[model samples]
Target: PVNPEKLLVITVATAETEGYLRFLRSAEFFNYTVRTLGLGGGGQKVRWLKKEMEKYADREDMIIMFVDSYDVILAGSPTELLKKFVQSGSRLLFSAESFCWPEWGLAEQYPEVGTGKRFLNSGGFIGFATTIHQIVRQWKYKDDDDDQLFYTRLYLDPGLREKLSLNLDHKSRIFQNLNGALDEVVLKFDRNRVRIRNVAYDTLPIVVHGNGPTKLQLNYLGNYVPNGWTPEGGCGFCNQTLPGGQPPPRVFLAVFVEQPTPFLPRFLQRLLLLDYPPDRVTLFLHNNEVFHEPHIADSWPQLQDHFSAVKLVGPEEALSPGEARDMAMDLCRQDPECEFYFSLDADAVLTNLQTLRILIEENRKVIAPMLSRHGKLWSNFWGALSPDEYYARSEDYVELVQRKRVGVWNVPYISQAYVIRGDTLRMELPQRDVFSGSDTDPDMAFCKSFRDKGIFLHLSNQHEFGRLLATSRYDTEHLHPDLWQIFDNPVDWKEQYIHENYSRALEGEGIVEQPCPDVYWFPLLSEQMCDELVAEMEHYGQWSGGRHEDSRLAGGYENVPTVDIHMKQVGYEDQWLQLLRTYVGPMTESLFPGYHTKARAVMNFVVRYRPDEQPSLRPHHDSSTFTLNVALNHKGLDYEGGGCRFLRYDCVISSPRKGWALLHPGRLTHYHEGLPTTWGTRYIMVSFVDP
Candidate 1:
């Protein structure tokens, strides 16, 4: 009641869009008296704004500021706005821009200015209440009346323009339109804050507008300006989170398995392992590859009752990636209880169990946890995009990925895995075709829509979440093809194929056992490897009868034949040899020191034994310097009684551990006898080294 000296911030909005929310957020931060003049989804700005400003026409001392509802943000303090307004020495100040829009032919009518914007923009302006009311009143409301065209007419009228001292902010001292002035303006960073620097005119702009196709650039600006984000403080507004014991927000988890993704089993397993209330989640899975259909089916029972709801669209649906992604977003948007939506690709391997918890508590609109390929700089997010809308690295791309400057970041694109708010989908991403447009991929289209709407795609590296798979060569050509990824995707290969205790053996732990004289027993292959190998051999359904003469061998004879299939028969010879060199090479150096046996091998095969088919083998020496044999499956579980016995020492391995390899000299020192298989199937993979 005393002064009423503050700026009367107001705008017209048909709807509260994502950018509008950002506009209001920036206003609230700078302590402006902000108001909006529009119904929820209808507005005639030129008419409505004119009618609304009539109420404050008599307030001569008060300043009235009007900005666009959606694509405008307050960059400077209200005090600075007042300072710039007082120094302008004018009653009305209109924002200036390079382009004369809504009336492109009016470009020639614009008054020339010295190395500054010449055209008038109705997006933003500040003036005394009397002048603002008079300016809006000049425009007669019409069916096709353009707001900028009306403002341009008033500024063009020589008598009204000169008498009232209506001036364009040509130098952008008060308002900065970011259309043609993108190159002129830059973001200036300071202590935990950011400001828009109009370096072309050396002016700190007060009002910033995405006046044209600069919403992308403005989103980039808004990512920093008005303290939208800070490295030191992470995110300014993301701290508003519910306390403990509160019911967690319901989430729609859309998992996409679009291709032959590697480690599909582990990916499915970790979904249930995520540290979240399962009842609060509704699972939606879309798999385009029939190769992943069984994987989806395998997980159905486990996921069916655990989650609040589960829906899976299999390959038969034949929907493209874009259509499928759009379906997921629409699903989440339609769900009334959905508070958040998580988009996950099967290629995204979640290593951290608390990934959902971290992202949810971060409280960002669209946020992705930083995921990188193991042992490489390849990541799930691009720091910047090229003119062709492809990947390009930002200045701090490596630093952020390497966690040198750790925090949430506004990125150009995100893929594989991300979490977004439900309100964000409804308010900001209302377009159902957001994921389906142009020639860009669904992820690209998705990111482009976000940019076009002035929405920031946030990336957080607050903690290690997971890693993205190198799935280019992943295929289901062979049984358990992930075992072959040892050369391409080495880390996941080690995780899925190598024995759980293999790391212990490498670290000199108690995983290695000495069962007999000159014989070493250590866990090597995974249980999955053993099962798949057995399954593959059984699938092949070809076993040589227990005959002494074997035509498959080069020598064409076997001294003591057993039912077996050679490694070459199933196309695993190369992978097995690599496994021998990488894994068995260590055991050779550690146990048989200074021997330096060549890692080369021959007679690599899996022998099968059952009471009916070659249960026992007579004492026979392998025709190699040394031999490595892996117990392919459990003895007590898969087979009742089956083991090997070293003849000279009379030492016996009564029960060989599944996936455990027994290494011993083959030619002379350790002539072994295959013990009788009393019952069930016995499968063992043997490799004669340096043959």
Candidate 2:
């Protein structure tokens, strides 16, 4: 360890941004004593630096290091830095770069190096106090005269260069200027810290100067370098416990379901699970779509007591989506106790319960946690705007979305979900027609208003927050629209509706029972799926009334029919066919050898049986090569007696299991008839394949 008083670090910082704090944290990590200057000024930085240096001019043994706070990060220890400075054998050394800045006329005056950088960068330097003081005493230029050019002129003088033993860090052993050399640096994380490796020079840079256009690149590196953040230890600055001696702030959660959204219940369930104090939260829910109204109505009553206040606005309120959003913001603005306004669209399925607390800790006027669709680049914010002010891909867009570059990014647009301070909301909240007049959508207009108020939209991807739900192609025309989302929103649809054993069956981990000859029984669907399908069919209130005449078939005639509704009647034919191909086709190929035909079927429908309606059916052969019969409800609980019997085999399937499918051939060998339902009701889904 170096002496505590031997090295004094100085930096010019007028304000505190995320970048400035990163520099401070890096300094702290290396056990450096930092002195900050120009905290209250718009004055030139060089003048502040010179003024601050007069006090330390007399200490000859003390080493002084100067760095720009906002654009620099310290990556090595003071002892290591002092050792490298002594090894250079120069009274003073400045960082090196590739280009001459502010004055290219003096480029020829700079001493050439055989390899590595040739030009001098004034952003970082280190030397004994005596030599640094002597250099500052020679300053004759005005405060505004460019600091780099001033240094360049002094270094260009051969007499002063010889007298002071001035030299450039040609090989970047101590300082790495990153303006034109982004390709040369790669971050290597040690067990306890991070350091930058100069791949071109084969040296480790102690100080990193993100000069000029490379500031953004440095911000990306600063996120992880010197242990500011790490994959294993997230956000070194974030305090997990709440701030002491203060009551938790009140937060207003504004929810918008403008369009028909899948998994509405699941979204509400996530809201109830948020890791925040329930007594400090108020909920403002507006649902403009009629399809989600029932879900909202059912969920709010159960969730009311969990929050301090609740406001529910239904579709009957006659408000547009934009108006609802604006009103939600206004409600938060009008409430004095509301410290934060959190806007969440139904499509943003936040899996992280601590998302609210984490965002609040960021302490920004407006901030959004990074949320994107799984396996997709679509996210909650746009990195760049096109000429038309729409979505345009930036060079770093992919890196940002993938979290390869994790930091707080100033973005042009944020939607799906975001958190805003109440004070900021009062100033930047949109008016009623803010979204109506522009070519942009409601989210764009809202973001434009914040930008107009000069508030930055900050997006943070420093953690694995959650994934967004794909709602752009969600269709509500079907009775159970989400069940048809196997193609559009496959992730959520499968998780909510598909059977867990479906994957097990494919992996050969579960048993496929053979109840009769050529008849296979397999677990096919979840209980939730069964309940939802039944509810959807009942909601449609359509049944065939068990007639022999039918118009739905290709021949326009049915030999026998039960109380049924075809998937086509509910706009689910394509989806059901796709499900059959995706889920059933593999199972079919596994069970029956050499039988493969895409599992294509036209007769996919739900059958309902009741003693008061259609109790039984006569024996007959099916018009299919093979058929699948899925029991949709429990036999003993939902109803009393319902089964199927094959006449040729004298076999019967009496106790049909809910969510289990019975698969068999539908030709002359298996002439089956529906047995009687003596009690309440029975529901089953039937599909005929390769017909």
Task: List TM-scores for all candidates, in order.
Answer: 0.80, 0.76
Residue 595 in candidate 2, Cα distance off native in Å: 9.4
The C-alpha lDDT values of all candidates are 0.82, 0.81
- How much RMSD separates candidate 1 from the native structure? 5.2
For residues 1-691, write the lDDT of model 1, one tens digit per residue: 2133457888887776667888898988888888888747122676887788789888787888888877788888888788888888889888888877767877787777878888888888888888888777766677465666677777888888888898889899999988888788887777777788888999989888987666656766776778866656655765426568788899899999888888887788778888889999999999998887788889799998788899999888889999999999898898778999999998888888988888988877889989998888999998767778878886668987888756677778998899989988898768899888777788888888887776778888878888888888765787767767877777888877889888788678677889897998988989888888889888888887734443122123455676888878888798888888888887787888787755888778888889887888777877778888899888788889759998789999999888789989877768688889998988998888987
Model 1, TM vs. native: 0.80
Choose the strongest candidate by TM-score. Answer: 1
Q: How does candidate 2 score on lDDT?
A: 0.81
Worst 10 residues of 2 by lDDT: 548-557
